[PDB]
Amino acid sequence: NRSLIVTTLLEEPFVMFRKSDRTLYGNDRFEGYCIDLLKELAHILGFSYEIRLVEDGKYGAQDDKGQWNGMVKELIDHKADLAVAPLTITHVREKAIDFSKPFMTLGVSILYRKGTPIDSADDLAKQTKIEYGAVKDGATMTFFKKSKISTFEKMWAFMSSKPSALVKNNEEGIQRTLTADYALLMESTTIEYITQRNCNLTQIGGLIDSKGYGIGTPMGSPYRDKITIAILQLQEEDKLHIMKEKWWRGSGCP
Numbered sequence: 001n002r003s004l005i006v007t008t009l010l011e012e013p014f015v016m017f018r019k020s021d022r023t024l025y026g027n028d029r030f031e032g033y034c035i036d037l038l039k040e041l042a043h044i045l046g047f048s049y050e051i052r053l054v055e056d057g058k059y060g061a062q063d064d065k066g067q068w069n070g071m072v073k074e075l076i077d078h079k080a081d082l083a084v085a086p087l088t089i090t091h092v093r094e095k096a097i098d099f100s101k102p103f104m105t106l107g108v109s110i111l112y113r114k115g116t117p118i119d120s121a122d123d124l125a126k127q128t129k130i131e132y133g134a135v136k137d138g139a140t141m142t143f144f145k146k147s148k149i150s151t152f153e154k155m156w157a158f159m160s161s162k163p164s165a166l167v168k169n170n171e172e173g174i175q176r177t178l179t180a181d182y183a184l185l186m187e188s189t190t191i192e193y194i195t196q197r198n199c200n201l202t203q204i205g206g207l208i209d210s211k212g213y214g215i216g217t218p219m220g221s222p223y224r225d226k227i228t229i230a231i232l233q234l235q236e237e238d239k240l241h242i243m244k245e246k247w248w249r250g251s252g253c254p
């Protein structure tokens, strides 16, 4: 019996400040796939909400102490009721928060420029001339830091041996791929969005893993199962199909 606090962070095309000449306030400041998703969920489940951006602007990772940051920490501390963002469902996080069923499936892949002999993650691990990395304190960095596969634990050694290999956010990683000889380990959903608007970048290889995005809630929250039921309803109504195609404009790349 009160409006739910929704934590999130800005990232194209999921959550962005809507462009306008007038000054906007409240939830109307935001647009994007995740904003449309929250609006549909709020209508089905019938709740009011307030969008708040996570202060540290991080998704969530654990330090060497076991403490969380980013949106994950907001849920653990019960400072937010829902986390509506491209929040990756991982087994590790399931022990600290609850996830709905996934509303989007994805995988880790590689962002790099076109016209190159590189075709796999193993090609990056076999050399040191081409730098590579990932976003700091994200599920992608966590995947390489926790991996027990020889190739990935070697790539993680290379990522953690260079100070600027791990970037603060997507924009820094994208710009580094453009200005330097650098490949970015990034989730396939954003790669699709970028390669559709930058014809000089492409996805290298396929998906290194397979996972999904889910709505995060504090552990034991009753809204988790309700959000799952709402997500399934949106799938059945083909509304998640429309939403992706609305915000993934298309490849104008010949």
Ligand SMILES: CN1Cc2c(n(C[C@H](N)C(=O)O)c(=O)[nH]c2=O)C1
Pocket: 011, 059, 060, 086, 087, 088, 089, 135, 137, 138, 139, 140, 141, 170, 185, 186, 187, 189, 190
């Ligand atoms: C959609 N973006 C692209 C992207 C994201 N994250 C955060 C991750 N979803 C999480 O929940 O921590 C990454 O770790 N690597 C990426 O390339 C979110």
Ligand SMILES: [Cl-]
Pocket: 090, 091, 092
């Ligand atoms: Cl995992």
Ligand SMILES: [Cl-]
Pocket: 193, 194, 196, 197, 247, 248, 249, 250, 251
């Ligand atoms: Cl696009």
Ligand SMILES: [Zn+2]
Pocket: 192, 248
């Ligand atoms: Zn697509």
